[PDB]
């Protein structure tokens, strides 16, 4: 990690969990100001960019794999028809309703 | 995560032998199966293969 490429190298060649590193982000008021450690991968979010900028949505599939995630909102319909989930670019994921009814969720980040 | 090392290790020599025996038998079963195409994916099939595998492993180690 001292050159532009070792980034990819460690990032996805080493811990997929590093990809979780990718998971990293932030959220609403409460939680966020509250602090900034430990998360939920699958939590609620709003997209702060793209036409979909400022759009209300929920995180369903934490998809560190393809290096991003899927939220019910950020979705598009096909051409044949059927509607389906959009490839969501980590980059503008704002979490807020901090998924926590899950005791463990609470324990870890709120 | 099911059976387990030590315990099965308690399971004596010729036993080890016996049970494996069968072990082959049933997995082979599976085989005839996959062939048939009758049943479905036995994450089982795979696992059992492994189970037998480790069995062996420890077995060997203990020292025949």
């Amino acid at each position: 990690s001292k050159q532009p490429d070792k980034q990819r190298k460690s990032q996805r060649r080493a811990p997929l969990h590093e990809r979780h590193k990718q998971v990293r982000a932030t959220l609403s008021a409460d939680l966020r100001e509250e602090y900034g450690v430990r998360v939920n991968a699958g939590d609620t979010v709003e997209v702060l960019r793209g036409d979909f900028a400022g759009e209300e949505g929920e995180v369903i599939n934490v998809d560190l794999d393809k290096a991003v995630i899927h939220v019910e909102d950020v979705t598009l319909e096909k051409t044949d028809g059927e509607e389906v989930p959009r490839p969501l670019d980590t980059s503008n994921v704002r979490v807020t309703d901090l998924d926590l009814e899950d005791e463990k969720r609470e324990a870890r980040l709120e | 995560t099911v059976l387990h090392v030590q315990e099965i290790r308690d399971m004596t020599p010729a036993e080890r032998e016996a049970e494996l025996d069968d072990l082959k038998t049933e997995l082979l079963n599976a085989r005839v199966q996959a062939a048939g195409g009758a049943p479905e994916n036995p994450g089982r099939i795979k696992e059992l293969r492994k189970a037998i595998a480790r069995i062996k492993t420890i077995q060997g180690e203990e020292g025949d």
Binding site: - | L20, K24, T25, L28, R31, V32, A35
Partner: protein, 76 residues
């Protein structure tokens, strides 16, 4: 050491083969009348009746055990 035989070799022929008599299958490749017919013998009720055998550019070996005068069961 362990296992034995391979599996049932069902080919139009195969199917009928085993059906009126004998039975044909997936025989690893090693073993032979001895080792092979054994595997059979121990598994399938019946004793080491008779056998013939072949390979083929593919990987699998195909062998034939002519029946015991007893059971086989349609679907192998």
């Amino acid at each position: 050491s362990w296992d034995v035989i391979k599996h049932p070799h069902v080919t139009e022929k195969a199917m009928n083969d085993m059906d009126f008599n004998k039975l044909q299958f997936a025989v690893d490749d090693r073993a032979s009348k001895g080792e092979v017919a054994d595997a059979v013998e121990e598994q399938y009720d019946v004793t080491v009746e008779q056998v013939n055998t072949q390979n083929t550019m593919d990987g699998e070996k195909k062998a034939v055990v002519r029946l015991s005068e007893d059971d086989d069961q349609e679907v192998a």
